[PDB]
């Protein structure tokens, strides 16, 4: 398939758009993890729950520093 891979290039293009959005906002997230988050909202999820998850997980790496 050829059109099914140009859509994957399209996914990477929006992923770089969200890369610029992540740096101007100063988030710690990288590209692989945001693709995991994209799949999470494919199944449907509260962003308020994902932010509480990540707002526990990042400042539970500051408790073993």
């Amino acid at each position: 398939a050829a059109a099914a891979a140009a859509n994957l290039n399209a996914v990477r293009e929006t992923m770089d758009v969200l890369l610029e959005i992540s740096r101007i906002l100063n988030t710690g997230l990288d590209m692989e993890t945001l693709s995991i988050c994209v799949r999470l909202c494919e199944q449907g999820i509260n962003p308020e729950a994902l932010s509480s998850v990540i707002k526990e997980l990042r400042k539970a790496t500051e408790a073993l520093k």
């Binding site: 994957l8 990477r12 992923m15 994209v38």
Partner: protein, 185 residues
Amino acid sequence: LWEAALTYEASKRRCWERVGCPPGHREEPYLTEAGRDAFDKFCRLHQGELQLLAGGVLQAPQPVLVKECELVKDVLNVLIGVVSATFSLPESISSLLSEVAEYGTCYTRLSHFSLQPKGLVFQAFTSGLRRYLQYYRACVLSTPPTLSLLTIGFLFKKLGRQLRYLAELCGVAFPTGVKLLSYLY
């Protein structure tokens, strides 16, 4: 799944007739910038032209076979004197085969001239000839591990002519004994 497939090489060829997001389909190289399938079809097409111009009874050898290195190995076996399946004591492959085949055909007829041990100076002389026959036999399979085929005909051009001159000296009626020893002197 996404990130596993994302990592591929993208479009760097750009269309000027499909400016908006070109997927690319490769601007079509030349006939001399294509080969080893277009080579074989190119040969087949010219031979098809030649058979049409003949009527189908022209019949050129080597339509396809064999290789590069294995053909080199059979050629190296002929230089010992071990004849091939084309000689005994594309179509242009047959010509290059003939030019190196006749050298080994000469070497066989020199060793066949020295196979026997009258004439006592002739007995010394024949044994002296085989001391260079061994040197010719030693040069092959010491210099090449296995080289390209054109190096074979090119490297053994300076060696085979020296071999060929002694065939003009030899008969293969003919002097022997003192009659040889004066003629040789």
